[PDB]
Scaffold this active site. Structure first.
Site, PDB file in Angstrom:
ATOM      1  N   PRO A   1     -11.285   2.190 -25.758  1.00 43.91           N
ATOM      2  CA  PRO A   1     -11.902   2.158 -24.420  1.00 43.91           C
ATOM      3  C   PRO A   1     -11.996   0.772 -23.812  1.00 43.91           C
ATOM      4  CG  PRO A   1     -13.491   2.815 -26.124  1.00 43.91           C
ATOM      5  CD  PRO A   1     -12.154   2.807 -26.773  1.00 43.91           C
TER       6      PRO A   1
ATOM      7  N   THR B   1       0.808  -1.210   0.000  1.00 42.27           N
ATOM      8  CA  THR B   1       0.000   0.000   0.000  1.00 42.27           C
ATOM      9  C   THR B   1       0.846   1.266   0.000  1.00 42.27           C
ATOM     10  OG1 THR B   1      -0.147  -0.007   2.416  1.00 42.27           O
ATOM     11  CG2 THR B   1      -1.829  -1.228   1.200  1.00 42.27           C
TER      12      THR B   1
ATOM     13  N   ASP C   1       5.438  -7.436 -29.238  1.00 42.68           N
ATOM     14  CA  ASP C   1       6.568  -6.520 -29.136  1.00 42.68           C
ATOM     15  C   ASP C   1       7.655  -6.821 -30.164  1.00 42.68           C
ATOM     16  OD1 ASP C   1       8.382  -4.586 -27.975  1.00 42.68           O
ATOM     17  OD2 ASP C   1       7.303  -4.889 -26.084  1.00 42.68           O
TER      18      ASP C   1
ATOM     19  N   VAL D   1      -9.990  -1.898 -23.921  1.00 37.72           N
ATOM     20  CA  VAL D   1      -8.783  -2.541 -23.404  1.00 37.72           C
ATOM     21  C   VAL D   1      -8.360  -1.828 -22.127  1.00 37.72           C
ATOM     22  CG1 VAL D   1      -8.107  -3.241 -25.723  1.00 37.72           C
ATOM     23  CG2 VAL D   1      -7.196  -1.126 -24.747  1.00 37.72           C
TER      24      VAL D   1
ATOM     25  N   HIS E   1      13.475  -4.776 -26.127  1.00 32.53           N
ATOM     26  CA  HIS E   1      12.221  -4.266 -25.580  1.00 32.53           C
ATOM     27  C   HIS E   1      11.267  -5.400 -25.221  1.00 32.53           C
ATOM     28  CE1 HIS E   1      10.009  -0.659 -24.659  1.00 32.53           C
ATOM     29  NE2 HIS E   1       8.955  -1.043 -25.359  1.00 32.53           N
TER      30      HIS E   1
ATOM     31  N   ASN F   1       4.243   7.543 -24.141  1.00 27.26           N
ATOM     32  CA  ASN F   1       5.248   8.322 -23.423  1.00 27.26           C
ATOM     33  C   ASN F   1       5.376   9.745 -23.957  1.00 27.26           C
ATOM     34  OD1 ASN F   1       5.747   5.782 -22.245  1.00 27.26           O
ATOM     35  ND2 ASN F   1       7.456   5.379 -23.649  1.00 27.26           N
TER      36      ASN F   1
ATOM     37  N   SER G   1       5.435   1.626 -21.620  1.00 27.84           N
ATOM     38  CA  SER G   1       5.750   0.290 -22.106  1.00 27.84           C
ATOM     39  C   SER G   1       6.198  -0.638 -20.988  1.00 27.84           C
ATOM     40  CB  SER G   1       6.850   0.363 -23.171  1.00 27.84           C
ATOM     41  OG  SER G   1       6.711   1.513 -23.986  1.00 27.84           O
TER      42      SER G   1
ATOM     43  N   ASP H   1      -2.962   7.423  -4.332  1.00 30.57           N
ATOM     44  CA  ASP H   1      -1.588   7.442  -3.843  1.00 30.57           C
ATOM     45  C   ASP H   1      -0.636   8.219  -4.741  1.00 30.57           C
ATOM     46  OD1 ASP H   1      -2.690   5.768  -1.984  1.00 30.57           O
ATOM     47  OD2 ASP H   1      -1.485   4.007  -2.503  1.00 30.57           O
TER      48      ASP H   1
ATOM     49  N   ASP I   1      -6.898   3.582 -17.504  1.00 29.83           N
ATOM     50  CA  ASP I   1      -7.644   2.747 -16.572  1.00 29.83           C
ATOM     51  C   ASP I   1      -6.912   2.471 -15.271  1.00 29.83           C
ATOM     52  OD1 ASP I   1      -9.899   2.114 -18.487  1.00 29.83           O
ATOM     53  OD2 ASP I   1      -8.238   1.191 -19.587  1.00 29.83           O
TER      54      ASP I   1
END
Length: 279
Positions: free
Chosen positions: A175, A16, A39, A177, A69, A161, A224, A260, A200
């Site tokens: 929306p 937490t 990827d 995914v 990557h 990014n 990523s 947080d 999300d």
């Protein structure tokens, strides 16, 4: 179970509060789930994958990850040391060349491939796809990601990014995914991390240690890198029977650490992926 001196991202998704080093996770560890890493490929021979990684499709001359990557994100999904879901099966789908770039058509084909390839695999706990890629807004790319999700795969995609609203980017703006933004070890939004209402969930995305090609390891920052955390968590939570592919993104959002993160612009969810594990 516990992993001492875990990468901060693994520790973060089992706590937490920021700043811990131990990753706490149920020993099932995503066993029986499968995660397609879409990827630059995976170096399946990396000992951190313990034979749980394999290439299933490439769209270039070679299946081998000549970039790193993909091997890095697969590592965050389910490598022994750096993985969220340490017993999950990893499937590599190479849609990016060794320079990390790839045509929209190629990326769409790779998503359609996973939607049907999963019917050949034994993943009794469910299927996840981790897409640590993206470009400008594309209706067709969005539609491909939505197809993959509706086919029964938990799709997790990077917000991008660009330090901008992810609505102008694909598949981040789809929306249906799970669009994943990045946070750093001090619970700040990553400096590069896209934001917006389409986001999300947030995952650890800054200075993320994971596998690299040549049997190596390195740290990389990017949404990523937050994406495989959430994909790994989904596979983990699916193996536990806590959620399904269709509900995992909202389940992770529901059970996330709330409020947080700092520098979350108004209108963007303040949610950090959390496995809620109790010993």
């Amino acid at each position: 179970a516990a992993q001492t001196n875990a990468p901060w991202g693994l520790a973060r998704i089992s706590s937490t509060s920021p700043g811990t080093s131990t990753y706490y996770y149920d020993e099932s560890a995503g066993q029986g789930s499968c995660v397609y890493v879409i990827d630059t490929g995976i170096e399946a021979s990396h000992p951190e994958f313990e034979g749980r990684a394999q290439m299933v499709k490439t769209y270039y001359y070679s299946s081998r990850d000549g970039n790193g990557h993909g091997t890095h994100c697969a590592g965050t999904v389910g490598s022994r040391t750096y993985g969220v879901a340490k017993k999950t099966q990893l499937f590599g789908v190479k849609v990016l060349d060794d320079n990390g770039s790839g045509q929209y058509s190629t990326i769409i084909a790779g998503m359609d491939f996973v939607a049907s390839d999963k019917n050949n695999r034994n993943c009794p706990k469910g299927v996840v796809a981790s897409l640590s890629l993206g470009g400008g807004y594309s209706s067709s790319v969005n539609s491909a990601a939505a197809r993959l999700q509706s086919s029964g795969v938990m799709v997790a995609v990077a917000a991008g990014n660009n330090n901008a609203d992810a609505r102008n980017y694909s598949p981040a703006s789809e929306p249906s995914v799970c669009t994943v933004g990045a946070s750093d070890r001090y619970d700040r939004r990553s400096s590069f991390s896209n934001y917006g209402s389409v986001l999300d969930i947030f995952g650890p995305g800054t200075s993320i240690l994971s596998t690299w090609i040549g049997g190596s390891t390195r740290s990389i920052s990017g949404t990523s890198m937050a994406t495989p955390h959430v994909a790994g968590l989904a596979a983990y939570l699916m193996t536990l029977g806590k959620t399904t592919a269709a509900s995992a993104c909202r389940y992770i959002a529901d059970t996330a650490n709330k409020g947080d993160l700092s520098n979350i612009p108004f209108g963007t969810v303040n949610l950090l992926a959390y496995n809620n594990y109790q010993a």
